């Protein structure tokens with residue numbers, strides 16, 4: 001069984017996407033996860049975008065787990081350097097029919113009141129108490145306290161290409177981050193047993209958030225745009 | 237106990253490098269692993285380049301294994317599309333004081349007569365009986381029959397950036413291949429227990445080869461140039 005989709009760009013009312021909270025598609029075809037008014041990103045924003053159809057990551061009958069590969073391009077523009085941009089964006093896999101969780105450093109995927117399991121790859125731009133220096137790429141399993149982390153230098157407003165690959169036979173999740181304009185390459189990998197943390201059917205998508213009001217800083221913001229996205233999964 | 241070296245270019249007769257067989261450094265500073273005469277790559281060629289000093293990847297006293305990262309840029313130019321360029325190049329780790337092995341699809345690292353252990357990342361351009369479609373990246377452990385493989389499309393004569401990383405805590409060896417002119421990205425990873433296959437001290441370097449005479453095709457060739465190379469390893473204790 002193989003499932004795959006490709007998005008060279010994004011259109012309004014796209015039927016294959018499920019937009020939640022502040023997420024929306026601009027007229028020039030970009031998926032803006034967090035609020036941007038008149039070219040200016042705002043604080044207190046959270047938004048998600050899920051693929052409309054659930055994907056089967058493993059089968060309880062055969063015990064087999066799926067392998068998958070997803071590539072996407074994003075752009076983070078940080079117009080206000082002081083005091084600190086926030087919060088970042090993530091690619092995540094979660095049970096279907098979930099709802100946006102808490103914003104801020106929780107990226108909109110974690111809900112303390114009723115936590116659901118999830119695997120996520122974060123591009124964290126704000127250093128919370130539980131964080132190492134930012135920006136960093138992090139692999140999260142059921143929590144935003146990354147199992148593995150790697151730092152990177154953001155190309156402010158530039159385009160970033162990401163490749164996430166998961167091999168079921170080795171349980172290796174490897175992610176590659178490239179900034180073509182700068183020619184920089186960052187890589188991180190870890191062992192994650194999907195079958196052990198997630199249910200057979202899941203949703204895949206993105207989530208992001210800007211500074212939470214509790215921080216009392218309106219400058220704690222930045223854009224979180226997704227320019228393209230392709231996904232592929234194979235369940236033998 | 238970190239160790240690291242960086243070559244942003246290659247000088248004529250590098251005191252830090254050991255060149256074997258056909259490997260040589262051109263006047264414009266590139267490390268040519270296989271023979272090129274008058275701008276034309278030839279067949280029947282094999283060459284290696286090792287860092288002159290051995291590196292310790294693990295310590296029997298503490299049992300600790302080293303983590304490392306290496307980056308390099310290479311370029312493979314294929315002048316003759318038909319009937320099939322050959323053979324490819326590899327980055328390898330082997331016991332010190334070894335000798336060039338068999339050429340052809342063995343890249344110069346495998347010696348059937350007297351095999352020595354090795355871990356290598358290959359960029360294979362010729363499809364041997366044991367190979368999947370080419371070109372492909374492959375992870376080799378003690379043999380050229382890759383444990384893992386992934387295909388890629390070569391940027392003929394272009395520059396390629398490679399990042400190889402090994403994390404001792406997870407035993408994950410991940411390699412990334414990027415062709416900046418094309419913007420293409422390829423990735424592959426696998427679990428490899430260095431401590432279990434290699435000795436405490438090893439050599440790190442490159443090896444490559446062009447078509448073997450047995451193939452009876454002088455067109456089975458291509459260049460195998462290394463443009464730059466940096467290495468870094470951390471052995472806690």
Ligand SMILES: *[C@@H]1O[C@H](CO)[C@@H](O[C@@H]2O[C@H](CO)[C@@H](O)[C@H](O)[C@H]2NC(C)=O)[C@H](O[C@@H]2O[C@@H](C)[C@@H](O)[C@@H](O)[C@@H]2O)[C@H]1NC(C)=O
Pocket residue numbers: 044213
């Ligand atoms: C952060 O954004 C939230 C919505 O994205 C704001 O809450 C919502 O505000 C709407 C307009 O005031 C209101 O109709 C909704 O009921 C409310 N949602 C709920 C129930 O929480 C949130 O704060 C609100 O709006 C500001 C302008 C003040 O009026 C507050 O008293 C509201 O709770 C925004 N945070 C802030 C303080 O900007």
Ligand SMILES: *[C@@H]1O[C@H](CO)[C@@H](O[C@@H]2O[C@H](CO)[C@@H](O)[C@H](O)[C@H]2NC(C)=O)[C@H](O[C@@H]2O[C@@H](C)[C@@H](O)[C@@H](O)[C@@H]2O)[C@H]1NC(C)=O
Pocket residue numbers: 079080081082083217219
């Ligand atoms: C939030 O972002 C604002 C826009 O960058 C900051 O103001 C800008 O500060 C610059 C020097 O840091 C100054 O050259 C710009 O003119 C100014 N832009 C405008 C029109 O606000 C702002 O910094 C604070 O406010 C400015 C006006 C100065 O008083 C600074 O000393 C203040 O820090 C940022 N606010 C915070 C809390 O950093």
Ligand SMILES: *[C@@H]1O[C@H](CO)[C@@H](O[C@@H]2O[C@H](CO)[C@@H](O)[C@H](O)[C@H]2NC(C)=O)[C@H](O[C@@H]2O[C@@H](C)[C@@H](O)[C@@H](O)[C@@H]2O)[C@H]1NC(C)=O
Pocket residue numbers: 315316317318319455
């Ligand atoms: C080995 O590579 C050579 C260079 O690409 C091939 O010759 C070239 O073949 C072209 C058509 O394939 C032809 O337009 C070119 O004029 C010619 N170039 C030269 C320098 O000869 C060669 O192809 C074969 O051998 C040559 C001598 C011709 O007889 C071709 O028709 C043959 O296909 C390549 N060898 C093989 C066996 O493919």
Ligand SMILES: *[C@@H]1O[C@H](CO)[C@@H](O[C@@H]2O[C@H](CO)[C@@H](O)[C@H](O)[C@H]2NC(C)=O)[C@H](O[C@@H]2O[C@@H](C)[C@@H](O)[C@@H](O)[C@@H]2O)[C@H]1NC(C)=O
Pocket residue numbers: 280449
């Ligand atoms: C393939 O490359 C080999 C070098 O690694 C050639 O080996 C030959 O080794 C001889 C022993 O020291 C040396 O004198 C020769 O110069 C050298 N090749 C030549 C002619 O330059 C090999 O050459 C073939 O095999 C040798 C043993 C002789 O019989 C030569 O006449 C043959 O050409 C190269 N083979 C081919 C197909 O070119």
Ligand SMILES: CC(=O)N[C@H]1[C@@H](O[C@@H]2[C@@H](O)[C@@H](O)O[C@H](CO)[C@@H]2O)O[C@H](CO)[C@H](O)[C@@H]1O
Pocket residue numbers: 086087103104105106126128210211212214215216217220
């Ligand atoms: C958990 C969370 O959403 N944190 C966000 C918040 O960080 C805290 C802030 O709430 C308050 O407690 O002060 C501390 C520093 O003493 C932190 O800023 O706000 C920032 C933006 O200002 C960001 O959104 C965090 O993710």
Ligand SMILES: CC(=O)N[C@H]1[C@@H](O[C@@H]2[C@@H](O)[C@@H](O)O[C@H](CO)[C@@H]2O)O[C@H](CO)[C@H](O)[C@@H]1O
Pocket residue numbers: 322323339340341342362364446447448449450451452453456
């Ligand atoms: C093992 C080896 O080095 N093989 C090289 C050889 O490939 C084979 C050749 O052995 C013979 O059997 O013919 C077949 C095709 O029917 C292959 O060519 O030669 C090629 C060069 O053409 C290459 O160097 C192989 O790696």
Ligand SMILES: [Ca+2]
Pocket residue numbers: 087105124125126127128131
């Ligand atoms: Ca954070």
Ligand SMILES: [Ca+2]
Pocket residue numbers: 323324341360361362363364367
């Ligand atoms: Ca081969």
Ligand SMILES: [Mn+2]
Pocket residue numbers: 122124131132138144146
């Ligand atoms: Mn984080």
Ligand SMILES: [Mn+2]
Pocket residue numbers: 358360367368374380382
């Ligand atoms: Mn191969």
